Each structure stands twice: as structure tokens, then as C-alpha cells.
Amino acid sequence: KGEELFTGVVPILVELDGDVNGHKFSVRGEGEGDATNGKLTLKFICTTGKLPVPWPTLVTTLVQCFSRYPDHMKRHDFFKSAMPEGYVQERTISFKDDGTYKTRAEVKFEGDTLVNRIELKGIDFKEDGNILGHKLEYNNQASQGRGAWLLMAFTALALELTALWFQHVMLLKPCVLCIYERVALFGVLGAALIGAIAPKPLRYVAMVIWLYSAFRGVQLTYEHTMLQLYPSPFATSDFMVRFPEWLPLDKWVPQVFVASGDCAERQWDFLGLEMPQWLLGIFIAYLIVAVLVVISQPFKNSHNVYITADKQKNGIKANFKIRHNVEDGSVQLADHYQQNTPIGDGPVLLPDNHYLSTQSVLSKDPNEKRDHMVLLEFVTAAGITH
């Protein structure tokens, strides 16, 4: 009957004593948690001076009882069922190509405040490594790869040069209503360049430009299909571009923005489709991938904590991986192995295989001169709907 304790907001207190290759430290956390909404705010402060490890490495160690378990998963919250007596949480965090954390936490209720006292032991770490070297950036949630935008710039520039190769070698001149599709693809390519300059801010500017240039591409190619599929009016005379005054792209680079020739004329048609029909699908593919990237951003930064039952020890086990963003683009794998056991003798809910969707944002207090870390977490349970 511990779920009734987490209705509303309850205070949190976190203390951590750690020792990593002899370097000792202490962290004191304070804040509040809301299990009904799946959030919790905390402000951790290092009390021994300067922290010898990056703050993101301690986030997983520094209270899964504040998870937003839906009503169809209420009988799977092992954390709340152990309260107020509490539970013990031991982990083994294996950092790839580096050391290994081994923690022992005691999460329980002390009257009205949820207390989590942890002992940490770091071993086999390297001073030149990404842990003891503080080479991990603060906001660790996504790799922010640069070669991904450059690869989209390749497939965008390849189509551009292929279009010019069709026109200047195969002697198939472009149409007017067509040519605008070159600008739309050029806007997609340009978005790939700004996005690849400094992706680790400003990427959103490149993404909306990519979103816009692809949507303009599906608009122009749609009109390009209807003119080429339906009976040509035959009386609507030919066309030329009408670029803006400040941007005479036909006057600046005439061999790319030409429009000598007009639409409503089937130039290429292969594999049962026309030239505007293939570009319509390409721009739709560009727009779909652009939409997928936007919808990915919320769930791109969250890690899943997969949980199984351990009825032999009347507890649970949990495995999950965490990739920390190293400075200069590298990745640091943190392999986690969790093991929870109740403290009290009251019965606990042994859950089926489910996972906890956890997303964390790290910030700073502009008026705190100590080594600190402001924390906010989003914990929601998901998995089998039964």
C-alpha cells in the first residue's frame, strides 16, 4: 500500500559517498518528486570541493520509486510496493574501455522525506580516460553526429549534379515549373550544411529549413505531375522563371537555373512512372525523414531501463546502457546492471518484463558557486499492455 504515499509531491534527500581510484568525494542532493506526473527536481551539490568525475556519470546512481506507472501497470511497481520500508539498490556500471562503478544504495522513507543514501566505489579508471579526464560534456542525451547531415548533403548534391548532367550531357533541357524543384532541393542541401557546421544549437534552424524545402518540393512536384499527366492545354504558351529581384539565380548561374523549355511534356518516363512522379516521391521521402527526425527528438534523448522479476530473491533486476557524449564527438558506453531487494518484510509486487522510459535534462544554477548539478527527470513505465 505504498502507492498512496507517492500521490502528490514528496521531498527527496540524496547523499552519496564515493571513492574512484582513491579520489574521494561526497554529494548532497535535495529536491521534490512527483510519481503521479513522473517528474522530480533535484539540486546536487559537491561538498568535498571539486568532483573528480563528470556529473552525467553519477546521474544513474543519484530513486526509481517516482515512476509514472499507468493504471494498466499498477501491479508491476515493485518500488512503491516496498515503501515505506524501502529497498536496496546495488549496481555494476561497466564503462567501456575504462573503469567500473559499483554502487550500493538504500532507498527508503524517513518519515516524510524519501531518502537515498548511496556508497560508490570506482576502480580501474584511467586518468587520461574520458571519466577522470572530464572529457564528457554536461548535456549527455544524444550523439549529435556530424556525418549524418553530411550524408544527407551527399544524397542532395548527388541529385543536383545528376540533374545538371541530364541537362548538359543528355541534352534534355529543364522546364520552368520544374526548375523551382532545383531550388527546393538546393534548400534541402543548404539545410544539410548549416546542420553539419555545428550540430552539437542552430540545428533547429536547419531542420525547419529542411522541413520547408521538402514541403515546397512536394508542392511543386505535385503540380508538375498534374500538368504532365492531365491533357496539356496546348494553348497555354511557354514560360520562364520569375525569381525575386535580389536573387537572380537564373542571371547569376544560368546553367543551373535555366528553364529553357516547358512542362506538360513527357521527357523521361521509366519503370511505369514519370520524372515529376519520381521527384514527388523523393521529396515526400525527404519530408517524411524530416518529420521523423522532429518526432525523434523527444524520444531520442531517453534511455529504457528494462526490468525483469527475481522471485528467487524476492526482488527485481534491471539492465540498460547509457552513451555519454565525449568532447570532440566520441562515445562512452556505460553498461548498467541493477539489482533491487526490499528492506522490510511486507510483500512486494514482482513485476513482469517491462521497461522504464527515463529522460533527464542537466542544467546549472547561475547563483551557486559550488560544484553542483541541477537535475530534472521524466520517468514513465511501459512495455507489455497485457
Ligand X SMILES: COC1=C(OC)C(=O)C(CC=C(C)C)=C(C)C1=O
Among 116, 130, 167, 325, binds ligand X (CB under 6 A): 167
8 Å CB contact between 116 and 134: no
Q: Which of 308, 316, 307 is nearest to 341 (CA)?
A: 316
Q: Which of helix, strand or coil describes residue 63?
A: coil
Q: Which is nearer to ligand X, 46 or 263 (CB)?
A: 263
Instruction: Establish if 163 lies at the interface with ligand X (CB under 6 A).
Output: yes
Residues 176-205 interacting with ligand X (rule: CB under 6 A): 178-179, 181-182, 185
Binding residues for ligand X restricted to 272-291, rule: CB under 6 A = 275, 279, 282
| CB of 80 or CB of 182, closer to ligand X | 182
CB atoms within 10 A of CB 311: 8
Helices (H), 72-138: 78-82
In the complex with ligand X, the residue whose CB is nearer, 238 or 368, is 238
d(CA 40, CA 106): 18
| Cβ nearer to ligand X, comparing 188 with 334 | 188
Among 18, 99, 174, 187, binds ligand X (CB under 6 A): 174
Residue nearest to ligand X (CB): 174
**Cell (9 digits) for 121:** 566505489
d(CA 274, CA 350): 59
Q: Which of residues 280-339 bind ligand X (CB under 6 A)?
A: 282
Instruction: State yes or no: residue 209 binds ligand X (CB under 6 A).
Output: no
Q: Mutual orientation of helices 275-300 and 203-229 as an angle, nearest 10°?
A: 150
Q: What minimum distance in Å lies between the beta carbon of 164 and ligand X?
A: 8
The separation between the first and the last C-alpha atoms of the chain, rounded to the nearest angstrom, is: 22
Shortest spacing between CB 251 and ligand X, in angstroms = 18
Among 63, 175, 227, 280, binds ligand X (CB under 6 A): 175
- Separation between Cα atoms, residue 163 and residue 253, nearest integer Å: 15
Which stretches of the chain bind ligand X, using CB under 6 A?
A: 159, 163, 166-167, 172, 174-175, 178-179, 181-182, 185, 275, 279, 282
